[PDB]
Structure formats: structure tokens, C-alpha cells
Design a protein around this ligand. Structure first.
Ligand SMILES: Nc1ncnc2c1ncn2[C@@H]1O[C@H](CSCC[C@H](N)C(=O)O)[C@@H](O)[C@H]1O
Ligand SMILES: Nc1ncnc2c1ncn2[C@@H]1O[C@H](CSCC[C@H](N)C(=O)O)[C@@H](O)[C@H]1O
Ligand code: NA
Lengths: 265, 265
């Protein structure tokens, strides 16, 4: 009868909400995609075991090109669920699928889950101080994306923090590390030379948020750029002007150099 | 010897994650605060029942002034949980509590849950397009705050959406409605004459995010200012220029006027 978009959360199958779990358990058919983000390798088997249903995993093409041919037809006479990493509508184009559902006469409901977008709170940076967000995309052949560099500049000018989602090419098992993101940014700085991202820029890295032991590190690019932050997924953040307590947390919790405790108001 | 910061999610007792619930159940002591926000879709009783643990509620003062003498002492020799609406560490001052834990020789871990920061994705507005966030505060006595108006201006100016949290008096259970927020913004507009918020401004209202049947409405202030958006909580969003896909979602899913497809894109 209906279609449920259910988020699985940040890191593993236990990041699903009780609400999402109880609803998924009652669905006739269950689909999912694992290309918009990276979760624990054992999330599928465990979530299948958790909801007690066989789950059909869909590729980006299956969804973007054939969602209304593979999933919607079933949601016409059965309760169907579509599982996704984190929150289904954050930094994805899945919201458009609700429009496809409506046009096919299918009612849809959304069950949220922990998202990397709000998990940034664990970095100690005030979430209301984040400005426009951006994605550091892998260059492709002669194509070298750079717009994310301009986002940092725009936010920095306003004293706002910049959240940088990192690229992912699931079919190729490619998950961009904060290290790779920093290298690309230094390359763009070389071209544009705007003094936006350099070896002296303070950055914050959050790896495997949602796990009980995520890696939270803050420091200068020259120091962080070759540091091991553990397995992906990773996000990179370029803070703007820091409040005293933000710097204090970065130093006490994220191991930032005590030098940042001193803020130039 | 361990303190767990656990989010309860958006609206009711089922918005906690499986991870959060299982951990809370194994804690010797469980504390909670409902001053940053209130779980309007449930009660303390229903949450206690789900967790199967007595829950000691803490006031703003208990937390802000005495966290280290109320919560931390017990965490030194037992597993303790601190429950908060939404996602932990989203509230501006909560991150600092982890510093207090460290200073007390107490380890702390964070269990995430859905936050309105990410749940607003259900409005169809791209998360990356959101800029700085603000809170609409009730004017009091001789104090007439207006910074939230300047935030909208700075974001909209750069084509970014503005997430506006509405004033709440948890203790008195007083919630500012989207309707009241709009009236206030018009009053502020009449004072600053910035051409930022008028009867012709397109806004989005999201009420009861997290529930299976949230109220999602989009339209011009002149039309929505007296519309019934249902029971709180309400969040107001003033989007910047829309991507055609965002506009289509608002029209098809949020009942927005066809007009936005030409006027606000
Ligand atoms: N647990 C996690 N830890 C660190 N970064 C994460 C993460 N989950 C997602 N990301 C970041 O976000 C990118 C996916 S973007 C999709 C996000 C998802 N809808 C959500 O709500 O979280 C990843 O490539 C990575 O840069
Ligand atoms: N379910 C919900 N729907 C709409 N707005 C909500 C909401 N829950 C909280 N808010 C908004 O946010 C304000 C409290 S801010 C506290 C938010 C919390 N830490 C989180 O992570 O979500 C409220 O006054 C209200 O305007
Ligand atoms: Na934001």
C-alpha cells in the first residue's frame, strides 16, 4: 500500500531508530542502497537478520533510472521499505523519489536516522555556525571540480564553518579520505591562490562517526595531511572564526595544538 | 567509569536508535533533560517504560551548573546515561560537558539520533544549501532582538536557506508557533526595511518532524501566516532561490503554489 524511506544511520545496523526497525519488520518487501555512503561491511547481513527479511540491494542506476519500475510497482499492493545509509534525504537526491512515488499513486513516509550532517556536533563546533556545505569530488579525466574551494572562502569570510562531504564511488570501492581531500584542496589553492586553504589552515577531521570510537582530530594541514585517521568514511571541516569553548573542545577532545586556544577576536 | 550521551531523537520514544536503547538499558543510572527541547509525541512515562529504567530528570541549572556533582560522580564507578532530545551535542553548550567528563577522569561516548538539522531534508530543500542557522526569540520588556533577521538576509543574499528555530519555554511548556514567528519577522521588517521578510516572502513550515505524519507546508507569508500547522513543535525555513527540483518537491509534496516554479527559481 505504501513506501517507507528508512534511514539506517551513521555507521551500523544499530543506528536505525526503533521506529524504523519496527516498521521495517512489518513491510512485505525491503530494498536498500549502499552507494550514497559507507556503513559497516556487516550492516546488510545483520540488518537482514535484525528485520528478519531478505533485502534486495539496488545500484545507483537501478534507483535513478528504474526506481518506478522496480520498487514502486510493489508499493501498489504491498508495504515496501527502501533503506539507505544515514538519513535518506540528506546529501542525496532521494527526495525526488517521493515525487515519483506520488505520480505513481503511491503514498510515501520518511523515517529519519542519525546523519553525518548533525553528527558534526561531536567536533565541538557549534552547529548553528556552519554555513553552506560542499562536496570534494574526485577529478575525472581532464575535469577538475573546484567549486567546493569557493564555498570555504565564502563561509570563512562570514566567520562560518564549512562541512565538506567527501566523494564516494561505491561500485569502484573508492571512498575519499580526509587526506586525499586536503591534497586536492592544496592543489586548488595553488591554482586560485586565494589564501583559502594552505599548510597553515586549521582543519577538523571526523572519521567513522556513529561508531563508539570515532576518530576526531583537529590541527594544521601541514600536520594532519599525512596522518592516519583510520578507515573511511571521513568528512573534512574547515572552521571559521572560533568561539573560546569551540577551541577548548578541539584541544581537549580532538587533540588540537594548544596554540589554537588563543583566538584572534 | 563511563558516561553515555544518548540522543532520543525527534518526537517520540521510538526515535531513539537501537544502539541507544540497548546501551541505555545496560546503564546503572539514567539521566535526562527536557529544557533544550521537549519530546511532544511522548511522555516521560512512555520513555521510562521503553528503557525499563528509572529516569532522573535534570533542569538547566542541574546540567549547566552542577553536571559534575550530579552526573559525573556516579559515572566514576558505574555506567551512566544522559538522554537528550534530538542528537547529542547539537545544543550549543552540551559539547562542553565532555570536557567536564575528561577533567573528572570519566570516559564518555556519544550515541547519535535524528536531529531537526538533518530531518529538515524532508522539506525537499537541499541540505548543502542551508547557511547559518538562528533562533527567533520573543521580544521582552525593552529588549527587541533582531539578529535572526540579519542571518536570513546574509544567507538569502548568497542563495542559501535559513533554518529558524522557534523560541520555547520548556519549563512553562510554551512553544512559539510558526505563525507567531512570521508576525515577528514582519514587525522586524517594518523596522529595518531591508526587504528581507515580507508578505511576498516564500517560507516553509515543518511541524512534528519525526512523526509518520508531519505537517510540511510551503507558500507565501500572506497566505500561511494564519494557517493552522497543527501542534508544536514548529520550525520555520526561509529558503533562498530554489533549484527547480526543490520547487517541484515543495509543490508536489508540501502543497506549495504553482507560482513558486517561476517566481522563486
Ligand atoms: N559515519 C560517517 N563518518 C564520517 N563521514 C560520514 C559518515 N557517514 C557519512 N559521511 C560522510 O558523508 C558522505 C556521504 S553523503 C550521504 C550522507 C547521508 N545521507 C547521511 O545522512 O549521513 C561520505 O562520503 C562521508 O564524507
Ligand atoms: N520534531 C521537530 N519538528 C520541528 N521542529 C523541531 C522538532 N524538534 C525540535 N524542533 C525545533 O527545534 C527547537 C529546539 S532546538 C533542540 C534540537 C535538538 N538538539 C535536535 O538535535 O533536534 C524547537 O523550538 C523547534 O523549533
Ligand atoms: Na547547517
Amino acid at each position: 500500500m505504501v513506501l517507507y524511506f528508512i534511514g539506517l544511520g551513521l555507521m551500523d545496523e544499530r543506528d536505525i531508530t526503533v521506529k524504523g526497525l519496527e516498521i521495517a519488520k512489518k513491510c512485505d518487501y525491503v530494498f536498500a542502497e549502499f552507494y550514497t555512503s559507507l556503513m559497516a561491511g556487516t550492516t546488510l547481513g545483520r540488518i537482514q537478520k535484525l528485520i528478519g527479511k531478505e533485502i534486495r540491494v539496488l545500484s545507483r542506476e537501478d534507483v535513478e533510472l528504474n526506481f518506478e519500475n522496480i520498487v514502486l510497482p510493489l508499493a501498489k499492493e504491498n508495504d515496501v521499505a527502501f533503506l539507505t545509509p544515514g538519513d535518506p534525504l540528506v546529501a542525496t537526491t532521494h527526495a525526488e523519489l517521493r515525487i515519483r512515488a506520488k505520480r505513481a499513486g503511491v503514498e510515501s513516509y520518511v523515517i529519519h536516522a542519525p546523519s553525518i550532517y548533525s553528527a558534526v556536533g561531536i567536533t565541538g563546533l557549534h552547529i548553528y555556525k556552519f554555513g553552506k556545505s560542499a562536496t570534494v569530488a574526485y577529478p575525472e579525466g581532464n575535469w577538475f571540480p573546484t567549486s567546493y574551494y569557493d564555498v570555504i572562502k565564502e563561509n570563512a569570510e562570514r566567520g562560518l564553518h564549512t562541512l565538506l562531504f567527501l566523494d564516494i564511488k561505491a561500485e569502484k570501492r573508492m571512498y575519499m579520505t580526509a587526506n586525499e581531500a586536503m591534497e586536492l584542496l592544496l592543489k586548488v589553492e595553488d591554482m586560485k591562490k586565494g589564501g583559502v586553504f594552505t599548510d597553515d589552515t586549521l582543519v577538523v577531521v571526523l572519521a567513522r562517526a556513529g561508531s563508539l570510537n570515532p576518530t576526531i582530530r583537529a590541527g594544521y594541514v601541514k600536520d594532519l595531511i599525512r596522518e592516519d585517521f583510520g578507515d573511511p568514511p571521513h568528512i573534512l571541516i574547515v572552521p571559521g572564526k572560533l568561539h573560546i569553548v569551540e577551541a577548548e573542545y578541539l584541544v581537549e577532545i580532538a587533540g588540537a595544538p594548544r596554540e589554537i586556544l588563543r583566538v584572534n577576536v
